[PDB]
Design a protein around this ligand. Sequence first.
Ligand SMILES: NC(=O)c1ccc[n+]([C@@H]2O[C@H](COP(=O)([O-])OP(=O)(O)OC[C@H]3O[C@@H](n4cnc5c(N)ncnc54)[C@H](O)[C@@H]3O)[C@@H](O)[C@H]2O)c1
Ligand SMILES: NC(=O)c1ccc[n+]([C@@H]2O[C@H](COP(=O)([O-])OP(=O)(O)OC[C@H]3O[C@@H](n4cnc5c(N)ncnc54)[C@H](O)[C@@H]3O)[C@@H](O)[C@H]2O)c1
Ligand SMILES: NC(=O)c1ccc[n+]([C@@H]2O[C@H](COP(=O)([O-])OP(=O)(O)OC[C@H]3O[C@@H](n4cnc5c(N)ncnc54)[C@H](O)[C@@H]3O)[C@@H](O)[C@H]2O)c1
Ligand SMILES: NC(=O)c1ccc[n+]([C@@H]2O[C@H](COP(=O)([O-])OP(=O)(O)OC[C@H]3O[C@@H](n4cnc5c(N)ncnc54)[C@H](O)[C@@H]3O)[C@@H](O)[C@H]2O)c1
Ligand SMILES: O=P(O)(O)OC[C@H]1O[C@](O)(COP(=O)(O)O)[C@@H](O)[C@@H]1O
Ligand SMILES: O=P(O)(O)OC[C@H]1O[C@](O)(COP(=O)(O)O)[C@@H](O)[C@@H]1O
Ligand SMILES: O=P(O)(O)OC[C@H]1O[C@](O)(COP(=O)(O)O)[C@@H](O)[C@@H]1O
Ligand SMILES: O=P(O)(O)OC[C@H]1O[C@](O)(COP(=O)(O)O)[C@@H](O)[C@@H]1O
Ligand SMILES: O=P(O)(O)OC[C@H]1O[C@](O)(COP(=O)(O)O)[C@@H](O)[C@@H]1O
Ligand SMILES: O=P(O)(O)OC[C@H]1O[C@](O)(COP(=O)(O)O)[C@@H](O)[C@@H]1O
Lengths: 312, 312, 312, 312
Amino acid sequence: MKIGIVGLGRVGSSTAFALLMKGFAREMVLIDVDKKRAEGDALDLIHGTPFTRRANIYAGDYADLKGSDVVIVAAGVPQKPGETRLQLLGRNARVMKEIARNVSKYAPDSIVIVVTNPVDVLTYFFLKESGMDPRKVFGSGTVLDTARLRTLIAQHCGFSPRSVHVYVIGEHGDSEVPVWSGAMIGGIPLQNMCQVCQKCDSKILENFAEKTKRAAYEIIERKGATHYAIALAVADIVESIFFDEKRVLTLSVYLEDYLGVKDLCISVPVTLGKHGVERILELNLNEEELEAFRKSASILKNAINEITAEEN
Amino acid sequence: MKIGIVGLGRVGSSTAFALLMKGFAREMVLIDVDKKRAEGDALDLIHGTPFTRRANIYAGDYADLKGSDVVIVAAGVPQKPGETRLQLLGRNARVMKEIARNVSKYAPDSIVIVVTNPVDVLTYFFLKESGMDPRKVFGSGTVLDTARLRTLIAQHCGFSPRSVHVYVIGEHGDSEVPVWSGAMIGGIPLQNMCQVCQKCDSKILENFAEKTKRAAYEIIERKGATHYAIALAVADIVESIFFDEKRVLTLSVYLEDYLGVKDLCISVPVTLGKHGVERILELNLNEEELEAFRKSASILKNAINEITAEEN
Amino acid sequence: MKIGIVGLGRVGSSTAFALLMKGFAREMVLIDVDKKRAEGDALDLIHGTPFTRRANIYAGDYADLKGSDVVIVAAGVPQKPGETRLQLLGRNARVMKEIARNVSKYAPDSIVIVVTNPVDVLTYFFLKESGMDPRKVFGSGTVLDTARLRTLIAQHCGFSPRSVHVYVIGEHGDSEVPVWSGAMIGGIPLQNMCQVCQKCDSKILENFAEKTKRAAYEIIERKGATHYAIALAVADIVESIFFDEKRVLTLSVYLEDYLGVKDLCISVPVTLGKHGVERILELNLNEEELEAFRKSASILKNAINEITAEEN
Amino acid sequence: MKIGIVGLGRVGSSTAFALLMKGFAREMVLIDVDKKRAEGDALDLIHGTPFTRRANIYAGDYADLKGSDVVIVAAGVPQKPGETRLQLLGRNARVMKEIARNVSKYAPDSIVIVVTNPVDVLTYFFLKESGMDPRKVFGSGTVLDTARLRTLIAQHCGFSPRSVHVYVIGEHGDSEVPVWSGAMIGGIPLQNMCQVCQKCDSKILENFAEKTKRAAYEIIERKGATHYAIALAVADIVESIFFDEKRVLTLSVYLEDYLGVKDLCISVPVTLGKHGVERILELNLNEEELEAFRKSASILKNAINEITAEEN
Ligand SMILES: NC(=O)c1ccc[n+]([C@@H]2O[C@H](COP(=O)([O-])OP(=O)(O)OC[C@H]3O[C@@H](n4cnc5c(N)ncnc54)[C@H](O)[C@@H]3O)[C@@H](O)[C@H]2O)c1
Ligand SMILES: NC(=O)c1ccc[n+]([C@@H]2O[C@H](COP(=O)([O-])OP(=O)(O)OC[C@H]3O[C@@H](n4cnc5c(N)ncnc54)[C@H](O)[C@@H]3O)[C@@H](O)[C@H]2O)c1
Ligand SMILES: NC(=O)c1ccc[n+]([C@@H]2O[C@H](COP(=O)([O-])OP(=O)(O)OC[C@H]3O[C@@H](n4cnc5c(N)ncnc54)[C@H](O)[C@@H]3O)[C@@H](O)[C@H]2O)c1
Ligand SMILES: NC(=O)c1ccc[n+]([C@@H]2O[C@H](COP(=O)([O-])OP(=O)(O)OC[C@H]3O[C@@H](n4cnc5c(N)ncnc54)[C@H](O)[C@@H]3O)[C@@H](O)[C@H]2O)c1
Ligand SMILES: O=P(O)(O)OC[C@H]1O[C@](O)(COP(=O)(O)O)[C@@H](O)[C@@H]1O
Ligand SMILES: O=P(O)(O)OC[C@H]1O[C@](O)(COP(=O)(O)O)[C@@H](O)[C@@H]1O
Ligand SMILES: O=P(O)(O)OC[C@H]1O[C@](O)(COP(=O)(O)O)[C@@H](O)[C@@H]1O
Ligand SMILES: O=P(O)(O)OC[C@H]1O[C@](O)(COP(=O)(O)O)[C@@H](O)[C@@H]1O
Ligand SMILES: O=P(O)(O)OC[C@H]1O[C@](O)(COP(=O)(O)O)[C@@H](O)[C@@H]1O
Ligand SMILES: O=P(O)(O)OC[C@H]1O[C@](O)(COP(=O)(O)O)[C@@H](O)[C@@H]1O
C-alpha cells in the first residue's frame, strides 16, 4: 500500500523506519515543513532498503498524498518559553486543521491515524476540519497503554500476553481508565487468578496502572521524548488494516453517544480492518469506572471548548 | 531443537513436513516399524530442504532419540476386519506401552506429545508405562477443536479469532464440552455479542459445536483419514515449547483431581512452555457443564478399565 | 491471490498444504476427477486454518478457475500393468490436453505451472493444446535439481547456498546438464574454491551431480513417490510471482530458438515475476555442455514426436 | 542471545531499535557515557516490547557485558570547532582503546562489530588495544555499500538483487574499490548483461559507483547524520552470526597479508558464522583494481601511522 507520514520529527521518523522493516509500504511519502530534514530522512531509509523490502520512499509535498491508503499525522510544534499549555494546544490545533484541509483535498479516500499529543483533543480538531468519515480518521489513543498493562500482568503471572484481557479507556492521559471489572487471565476473572499467581496482589495491580500511565513522562525526563514505543504501536495498528484483521483496539474514535459521553473523540474498544473502524464495543462499566470514564470525557470536552474559544 | 517422530503414517509424515517448514528442528529422527517407508520419507524431506531451514533429518531406530527435546507419537495400527473397538484399542494400547519403555530409556528428558486416537485413552496408557513426569508427557487433546470453534464464531461475527474466547474440554471425542458459560468476544459475554452480531443466534452456535465435533468423521468418510489439521496443531503446540510462550492450550493432561474427576488424562486449559506444562487452570463450570465434563471423564475411565481388564 | 490446483494426488495435495502454510492463497480451488477425495482434502485443510491464514479452500469443477491468478497441474494417470512408457505418456499427454482446453476457457488470464512427469514433454503438450502465452505457461523443470546441487556444494564447503552459483539445464531427467563452466562460490570459479575447500574435489562434485539426478528414483524405490520436495519448489516458484521478485529460475520454457535448440519446452535460466516469465538468459556453454544440452533437446523432441505420432 | 551496544547516539539507538524488531536479543545492555540518555532509551524500547519479542533491555555499565554474545561499538565524539581531522581521529581512537580494555575484561568471549567512522582505522585501533581474536572483532566496513551497489544495478535491469554479484572492497570511504571484473548478473559477466539490459550502459554503472560512495555525505548535508542504513546493515550482520549462515560479507577484517597489503584492517569477502569470521576469500583483482586496492591500504596505514605518532 501507499503510506504518507506528515511530520517527520522523532516520532514520524521512527514510525517510518518501523513501517519500512515491517514491509507494509510499496510507496512512502514523507512530508514535513522542514523539507531538507524530510529529504535526508528519505535518503537514509532508501540507503537501507537493500536489507528490507523494495519501497518507493521520497520526501514530497501535499499533492503527493494522492492515492494514499493510510496517512499518519505525527506533526506538531514545541512549547515556546513562557508558553501556556492552552496556547501550545492552540498552536497544535491550528497545525491539525491545516494538515486536514490538505489531506481532505488530495487523499480524500485514505484512512488517517493521528498520533500527536494530546491525541484525543487533536484528533477531534483534525476530524472536524477535515470533514471525513469518523470511521476512517482516528487517533492511536490508549492502544499502547492497554498492551503495556496486559504485558506487565502477563509476565508477572507466567502467562502469554495473549491470555490476558484488560482494556484501558478514556483520555490517553492522566485520567485514563483501566477497566479492571472485565479483566481476566484464561477467561478466569483477574481476582481469582491474581491471588493464585504469586507475583500478583492488589498493591501490584495498582503499580502497573501507575507504571503504564507514567511511562511517557519517565522517558521524557530522561531523553526529552518518546518515539520508539508509539512507532511500534502505529505499525501494529497499520498491520490490522493491512491484513484486514478486525482486531479489537482501544483507538480514540469519534463517538456520537457512548455511555452518555457525546460529541468527542476518546478511546474505546473498536474493531479495525482494511476499511477503517467497523464495530464499536460498548463496555459494561461498573459504577466507579463509569464515573471515571465520564469525568475523562469532561476533561477532554473542556479542553476542546477552551481552545475552540481562544481562536474566536 | 531435536525432534523425534515415532509413527510416520499420514499424520506422522504430515507433522514432519509441517515442522520442517516452521523450521523448529535442527535434527529430526523419523521412526516407524516400516523402516523402508520412513527412509523414503526422510529422503523426500531432505530433497526439499533447499527451500527450508537446514535440518538433519533421517530415519532411525529408538537409540537415536537420545538428546531429543520433543518426541511425537503418531504411531498406531488399523482396525482389522471383524475387529472390535475394544480389541483395536487393546492393540493400540500395547503399541503405546512398547514405544513408552523405549522413549523412557533413550530420551528420559524429552517432552512427549501423544497424537494417536483415542488421544486421552492412549496418552494415559503411554504415561503409565513410561513412568515419566505428567508435566512433560501429554496428548494434543482438544487443542484443534477449541481453535476451530473460536474460528467459526469469529469469522461469522466480524472479529479476529484473537478476540474470541471459548474452551472445549473433556474427551477429545463425542462427549467433548464447549464451555459456553465463559465464552466471550471482546471480553463481552458471548450472548450479548451474539445477538448484536447478525450471523449469530442460538441455532448457529449449536451448529458450530456440531461442525467441530464432526470434522474428523466427515474428512474420514471422504478420504479415509485426517492428517493436515492435526499436523498444523502439533506444530502450533511445539511452537509454544520452542519459544517458551506459556500460552493456554486445552491439552489432554494427567489430572490427580480436577473438579472431582481423578486419575486420568483429559483436556483442560493448561499453560505450555519450554519445560512442558506449568499451570493447570481450574474452570468455573456451570451445572450442566460440570455434569457433562464428569460424564466425559467416566466414559474415558470405563474404556481405560475395559482394556486394562482385557490384557490380564 | 486465487490459486487453482488440478490433480490432488500426492503432489497436488502436498503442494496445497505447503501453499496454505506460506499463506499465498486468499482462495484455493482443488480439482480432481475423484471429487470425493478432493472434497475430504479441502475439509482437512479447512480444519487446520485456525493455525494458518484465512483462505477460501474448496473442491470445485473447471468453471471455478475463473479469476485464478495461478493454476497448478499435478494431474496424471498411473502406469497400468504391461503398459509401455510411450503408451503411458500417450495417456498423460491426453490428460494434459483435456485440462488445457478447460483452463484456456475459464481462466485464460492465469499463469500455469505444470508439474507432472515427464515435465518438459507434458508442458509442451499442455501449451500447444491451450493456445496461451508461452510466458505464462511453463513447467517447474530443473528448479529443484539446481537448488539441490547448490545446497550439496554449499554445505560441504562451509558457505551459504546464496554464495554458490550453478545451473542445471536441459531435460528434467537423466540427460540434465549441470553447467559446471559457470559455477562459482563467492564469484570465484568453482575449481579454485573447490580445492581450497577440504570436503570438495573432482570425485565429489561428480557424486553430487549423481545424487541430485537420482534423488527421485531413490525416494520412489522406498515409498513409491516424491511429493514433499516438489511441493516446496512449487511454493518457492509461486513465491516469486506473488512478490514479483524477478529471481532467476531454471524453469522448463517454450523456446523458439536457444543455442540451436528449437520448438520445444526445456529448462534454462529465466526470470519470474507477477506477469510470468520475463527474461530468458542465454548461457555461454562450453563445448561438451553445448553438446549435452543439444542431445537433451533431441531426446525430448523425439519423445514429443513418437507420442504426436501414436494418436494419429 | 545477549547483545551489548556501547555508544547510544543516533546510530547506537537506531541499531538497538532495529535489533529489537528483528528479535535477536533475549537481553540487551545499552552503555553510553551519558547514562541518563541511555536509560530513557532503554525505557522507550521497553515500553514498545508489547509489540515485539520479550527482551531484557536496560542501561548498564561495563560489568554488564558479562555473557554477551555480541557487543556493538557505535561510540564516538563529535568534531570540536577548529578541530583537525587528525585530532578528531586522535580523540576517537582513544575512545576505541578505552572501550576495548573494558570489553576485553568483562566480555572476552564476545564477537565485536565496530561501526564508528573511520571504520577501518578505528577497528584496527580497537583490535590492537583489546588483544582479542581477529576473527571475532571486526568492523562493518563496506557491507552496506556492496549491498547498495547490487541493488542499484538489480532494479535497473529487472533482476532480483540475489542474481547480482559485485563486491566493493578497500577503505570504507572515498577510496573504496568496486570489483567490476567479477561482476555478474545470472552468472553472466556484467558487460554482456549490461548491454542487453536497457537502463544500463557504461555511464550508468559509473553513476552507481558514485551514488553509493556519496550516500552518507548526501544524507549528512541534509540531516547531519546517517543512522538508519547502518542500523539495518548491523542487523543483517548479526543475523548471520545468529543463524550461523556463513554468508559472504565485505567486512573490515584484520589481514596479515592479502594481495600484498599487510598489518591493517580493511574490507574483503569473508564468511561470517556463529563463531565469527571463518574464511577470507582472496579475490582475483585485475591490474587497475589491484592498484586501487593497494593505494586504499596505504591511505589507511598512513592515517593509522599519523595517529599512532601523535599520541607519543
Ligand atoms: N515525547 C513525545 O514524543 C511528545 C511529548 C509531548 C508532546 N508531543 C506532541 O506530539 C508531536 C510528535 O512529537 P515528536 O517528538 O515526534 O515531534 P518533533 O519534536 O519532531 O516536532 C514536530 C515535527 O513535525 C514537523 N511539522 C510541524 N508542523 C508541520 C506541518 N505543519 N506540516 C508538516 N510537518 C510539520 C516539524 O517540522 C518537526 O519535524 C509533537 O510535535 C508534540 O506536539 C510529543
Ligand atoms: N483419520 C485419522 O488420522 C485416524 C482415524 C482413526 C484413528 N487414528 C489413530 O491414530 C493413528 C494415526 O493415524 P495415521 O492415519 O497417521 O496412521 P497410519 O495409517 O499411517 O498408521 C500408523 C503408522 O504408524 C506406524 N507404526 C505402527 N506401529 C509402530 C510402532 N510400534 N513403532 C513405530 N511405528 C509404528 C505404522 O507403520 C504406520 O506407518 C492411527 O494409527 C490410529 O490408531 C487416526
Ligand atoms: N513420484 C512421483 O511423484 C511421480 C513419479 C512418476 C511420475 N509422476 C507423474 O506426475 C504425476 C503427479 O504424481 P502424484 O504422485 O501426485 O500422482 P497421483 O498418484 O496422486 O495421481 C494423479 C492424481 O491426479 C488426479 N487426476 C487424474 N486425471 C485428472 C484429470 N483429468 N482431472 C483432474 N484430476 C485428475 C487423479 O485422480 C489423482 O488424484 C503422476 O500422475 C504421474 O503421471 C509422479
Ligand atoms: N553520520 C554519521 O552517523 C557519522 C558521521 C561521521 C562520523 N561518525 C562517527 O561514528 C560515530 C557514530 O555516530 P552517531 O551519529 O551515532 O554518534 P553521536 O552523535 O550519537 O555521538 C556518540 C554517542 O556515543 C556516546 N559515547 C561517546 N563516548 C562514549 C564512551 N566512551 N563510552 C560509551 N559511550 C560513549 C556519546 O555519549 C553519544 O551518545 C560518531 O561518534 C563519529 O565519531 C558518524
Ligand atoms: O510532489 P512531488 O514534488 O512530485 O514529490 C515527489 C518526487 O520528489 C522526489 O521524492 C525527490 O524528492 P527529493 O529530491 O526531495 O529527494 C521524487 O523521487 C518523487 O517522484
Ligand atoms: O485469551 P482468551 O482466551 O481469548 O481470552 C481473553 C482475551 O480475549 C479478550 O476478549 C481480549 O480480546 P482483545 O484484547 O482482542 O479485544 C479478553 O478475554 C482477553 O483480551
Ligand atoms: O540409530 P542410527 O542407526 O544411528 O540412525 C541414524 C543414522 O541413519 C541415517 O539416518 C541413515 O538412515 P538411512 O540410511 O536409513 O537413510 C544416518 O544419516 C544417521 O546418522
Ligand atoms: O464450481 P462450484 O461448484 O461453484 O464449486 C465451488 C463451491 O463448492 C464448495 O466448495 C463446496 O464443495 P464441496 O461441497 O464439495 O465441499 C462451496 O464451498 C463453493 O462455493
Ligand atoms: O551493571 P548493572 O548496574 O547491574 O546494570 C543492570 C541493572 O540496571 C538496570 O537496568 C536498571 O537501570 P536503570 O535504572 O538505569 O534503568 C536493571 O534493570 C539491571 O538489572
Ligand atoms: O546469484 P547467483 O546465481 O548465485 O550468482 C551470483 C551471485 O553469487 C555471488 O557469488 C555473490 O555471492 P555473495 O554475494 O554471497 O558473496 C556472485 O556470483 C553473485 O553475488
